[PDB]
Amino acid sequence: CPLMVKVLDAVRGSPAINVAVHVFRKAADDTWEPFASGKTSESGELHGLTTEEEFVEGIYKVEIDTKSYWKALGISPFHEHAEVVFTANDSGPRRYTIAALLSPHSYSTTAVVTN
Amino acid sequence: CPLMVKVLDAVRGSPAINVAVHVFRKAADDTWEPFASGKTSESGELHGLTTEEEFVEGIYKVEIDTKSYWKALGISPFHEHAEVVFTANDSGPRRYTIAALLSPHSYSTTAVVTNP
Amino acid sequence: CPLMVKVLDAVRGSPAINVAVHVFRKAADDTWEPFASGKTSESGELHGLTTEEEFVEGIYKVEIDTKSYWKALGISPFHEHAEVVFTANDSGPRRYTIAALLSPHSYSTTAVVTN
Amino acid sequence: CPLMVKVLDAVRGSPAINVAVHVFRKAADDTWEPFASGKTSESGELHGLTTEEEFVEGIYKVEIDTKSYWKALGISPFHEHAEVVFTANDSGPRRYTIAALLSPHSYSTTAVVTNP
């Protein structure tokens, strides 16, 4: 898959499991429209979000429902969710891995782009 | 100052200067309405975005224009911007400091919440 | 393997490859002694550092030669290296993954402990 | 103040108070020699660790006792401490700010280097 998502819990030191993830693509009128979604596996990963044919150039937004994740663990969260917005470009073969590291009042997100 | 934003450059190890910042508040119709904007100073900090009187309860979005920052220095970043969304003042007024650490392909954001 | 290491470059957005990694164990006299070492693969990972029998409880230090990594890319680094010190405990099955995200003047390290 | 250390709590979103900090300088025999120590205040900052006159060239180690911090609040952390090692003043005197963001199983450290 050209687009992969991996979430980690910095508090417990483990993958963040069963975390809802929504992907959106920016439409011609600048509104966001559903593209893909799913929940992280037991490894904190979410694969098979899309395919090469479907994944065309453009601006994409990846939304991670961190709020629910924390509520579920009985921990008070600051953010409503963790957003990641980027432009997918066909500069040769490219796989996109959006890595997110979570804490109740802080999160880190990194993009690993490999060929 | 109830809402402050601080940005650092992780590559250079210095304050990220002139970083444009846009704040939005979710309207009673679920669309993002402009609330305030500014640019970081030489210390990488942005003060005076709003006031206690005007900073009411609500869901806020702090948009840091990271892309313009990196492009402004010959670098082609991954993210379009960094957006921090959170509910504020739902337990009474608080002072919020939104910190962001920037790298071309990665960013970190922390929120420091204290009382007045 | 009970101990794994993964390094990412936050500047280029890819795994940090061919990065030297040294593991040490704290001896009875508090000095650090060689335990294991290697260089990250093309995936930015370093496996097979040790085995269950060898990996006993105690205090371990994982040293990542980030300085060389940056020098090699013609980029000026701040830190001499990135250290990670922790206590390995036999609280039931445990695999240790030390994740490091690198930037010239900043680094993040997370420990993913799974069963 | 040529060397300052700031620590934040990523779980709570507040300054990490009373965090013990030990600084060492590599001696001409490759062993770590005590240079200075202190604890973070209520703002999570530690000032006055050393002076311009005493902070000479060298390889320094800043040891932040994260474990004691987390244990002091009923939490069993992963790391023993966070150690920041770096060469300082090799291009003339600079002001260094070592920042650290703490979580029970993870930490981030950034170095801000500026001129006087």
Side-chain angles (χ1 to χ4, degrees), chain C residues 41-75:
Chain C
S41 63
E42 251 166 5
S43 61
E45 286 171 29
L46 176 57
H47 306 282
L49 276 164
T50 179
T51 58
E52 281 167 50
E53 283 207 311
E54 301 181 57
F55 200 55
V56 301
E57 296 187 305
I59 299 182
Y60 294 75
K61 177 168 72 172
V62 179
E63 186 164 297
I64 303 173
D65 187 350
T66 58
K67 187 184 190 187
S68 304
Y69 178 64
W70 294 118
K71 281 188 180 180
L73 295 182
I75 286 163

Side-chain angles (χ1 to χ4, degrees), chain B residues 96-111:
Chain B
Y96 303 76
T97 292
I98 301 300
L101 171 63
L102 316 174
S103 291
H105 280 65
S106 182
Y107 68 90
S108 185
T109 192
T110 66

Side-chain angles (χ1 to χ4, degrees), chain D residues 33-95:
Chain D
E33 188 171 298
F35 182 75
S37 66
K39 293 184 163 190
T40 62
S41 65
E42 293 175 66
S43 58
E45 301 183 310
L46 170 53
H47 301 276
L49 276 163
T50 187
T51 67
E52 296 187 294
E53 217 183 70
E54 150 187 302
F55 190 44
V56 298
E57 287 191 286
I59 300 184
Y60 290 78
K61 173 153 75 174
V62 174
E63 186 171 283
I64 310 175
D65 299 311
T66 57
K67 186 173 190 177
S68 301
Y69 175 70
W70 291 118
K71 284 195 58 188
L73 222 168
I75 301 175
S76 184
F78 182 77
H79 306 81
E80 286 292 302
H81 53 240
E83 288 180 306
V84 187
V85 192
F86 61 97
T87 298
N89 311 300
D90 52 312
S91 303
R94 296 285 186 289
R95 281 178 59 119

Side-chain angles (χ1 to χ4, degrees), chain B residues 29-48:
Chain B
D29 70 301
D30 272 54
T31 64
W32 295 104
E33 188 171 298
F35 182 75
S37 66
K39 293 184 163 190
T40 62
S41 65
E42 293 175 66
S43 58
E45 301 183 310
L46 170 53
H47 301 276

Side-chain angles (χ1 to χ4, degrees), chain A residues 87-99:
Chain A
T87 302
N89 177 199
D90 299 330
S91 66
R94 278 187 169 186
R95 280 189 170 201
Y96 293 74
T97 301
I98 304 299

Side-chain angles (χ1 to χ4, degrees), chain C residues 80 83 85 87 105-107 110, chain D residues 80 83 85 87 106-107 110-111:
Chain C
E80 288 293 297
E83 287 180 354
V85 181
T87 302
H105 279 75
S106 181
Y107 68 80
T110 308
Chain D
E80 286 292 302
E83 288 180 306
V85 192
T87 298
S106 182
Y107 68 90
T110 66

